[PDB]
Swiss-Prot record:
It catalyses: The enzyme cleaves the 36-Pro-Pro-37 bond of cysteine desulfurase (EC 2.8.1.7) removing three amino acid residues (Tyr-Ser-Pro) from the N-terminus after cleavage by mitochondrial processing peptidase. One of its GO terms (cellular component) is mitochondrial inner membrane. It is found in: Nucleus; Mitochondrion inner membrane. It comes from Saccharomyces cerevisiae (strain ATCC 204508 / S288c). SMART domains: AMP_N (SM01011). One of its GO terms (biological process) is proteolysis. Binds 2 manganese ions per subunit. Pfam families: AMP_N (PF05195), Peptidase_M24 (PF00557). It is a peripheral membrane protein. Its cofactor is Mn(2+). This is Intermediate cleaving peptidase 55. PROSITE patterns: PROLINE_PEPTIDASE (PS00491).
Amino acid sequence: GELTPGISALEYYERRIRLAETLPPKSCVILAGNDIFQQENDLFYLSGWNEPNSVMILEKPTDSLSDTIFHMLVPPGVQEIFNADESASINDLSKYLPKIINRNDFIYFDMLSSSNFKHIKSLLTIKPISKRIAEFRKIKSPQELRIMRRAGQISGRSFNQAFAKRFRNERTLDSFLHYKFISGGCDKDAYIPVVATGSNSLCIHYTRNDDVMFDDEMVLVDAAGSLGGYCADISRTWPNSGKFTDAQRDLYEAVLNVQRDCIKLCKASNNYSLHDIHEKSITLMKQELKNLGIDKVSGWNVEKLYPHYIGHNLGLDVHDVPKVSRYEPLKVGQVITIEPGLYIPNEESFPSYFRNVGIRIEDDIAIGEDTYTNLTVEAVKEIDDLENVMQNG
Ligand SMILES: [Mn+2]
Ligand SMILES: [Mn+2]
């Protein structure tokens, strides 16, 4: 019954109806797919069509939802499997598209690099559309929450399998997690992974993933799988030796405390915005820095030791729906990550056992009415849970 993994063909139809319920009479939405594979997600959200060199048109000729028309121009079944009301070859674009534009007053199309995009743009009231769909994508349906839970569950269990094994080089740990994501049931990597051991964890954008791992440092890993186009996002940090030292413990619990207290905020009744939570993450991280006695270091305030945001919306993209307001209260159905971090520089003004230690703990949280749902709860992160899996398996 599914059209793409986790989503039925009925929901795709319902998504196109929800968009049409916002359009005036004699409108048409034009979405150009990608070329050679990562489909255009606005197109994928409404069609489930995952092929290159394709154009979708959603047309509302009157004010009745029963008159809408779902056009699909594909490379030379689309009507029977994807429920396209009309279809034609993509070669017919120059003869097919102008007939539709001329009979409509409002053209929903983003004028700002696909080949069919430059084609359609040259043919051209023009209104943007990608942001209006973003307001729909930021609210996940129960089916979408289920398929994301499956992605995070597969990714989470893959981390636990890695916890029980010893890795002498980053690239082995990289290829291992990739295989477990795929054999666990995922389509691909959700994003380019980070496998940073020791001082490598201080580079926020480290992706080389080929350095040797030593028995005295911890490894920071940001990696997760994708299923049906939906992405998970997990970060974990654990010692290579398999046991936390007293220093590695104190720093890890600081990041874990900030993350835990922030996850507890993700209830829609709290009326917090994503930025509201981030500013609370700064406050909490300051207090943890004070508990460790490293908050008042000159030139290294909390912004330089915690130098990124608390998280981001998650969905078809890793950094999902970027065009939605970070300042409006979180609504039921949104999926955001909670990923605070600490990264101590190699400065003698810091204790020696803290220098060159970077830590980040990331989980995917879905917003509920009076609670939340940890979509990545399987990947253990408590020190006693971590040390148990590492030494016993
Ligand atoms: Mn991440
Ligand atoms: Mn993230």
